[PDB]
């Protein structure tokens, strides 16, 4: 609270790149989580053998 300053105006470019890749990963992660969800049973079987 003391020194955060409430201001985050600059990406710094390199940070923006890594984060964008990460945001893209989040989108892919969402659909992997969603397909795993729709095929609940098949993924369960993998876990039992695991």
UniProtKB/TrEMBL annotation:
Domain of life per record: Bacteria
Subcellular location as annotated: Cell inner membrane
Family affiliation: Belongs to the resistance-nodulation-cell division (RND) (TC 2.A.6) family.
Listed name of the protein: CmeB
Residue range from the parent sequence: 496 to 545 of 1039
């Amino acid at each position: 609270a003391l020194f955060l300053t409430r201001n985050e105006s600059k990406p710094f470019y390199f940070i923006q790149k890594f984060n964008d890749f990460f945001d893209w990963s989040t989108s892919v992660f969402s659909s992997g989580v969603a397909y795993i969800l729709k095929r609940t049973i098949r993924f369960v079987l993998v876990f039992c053998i695991m």
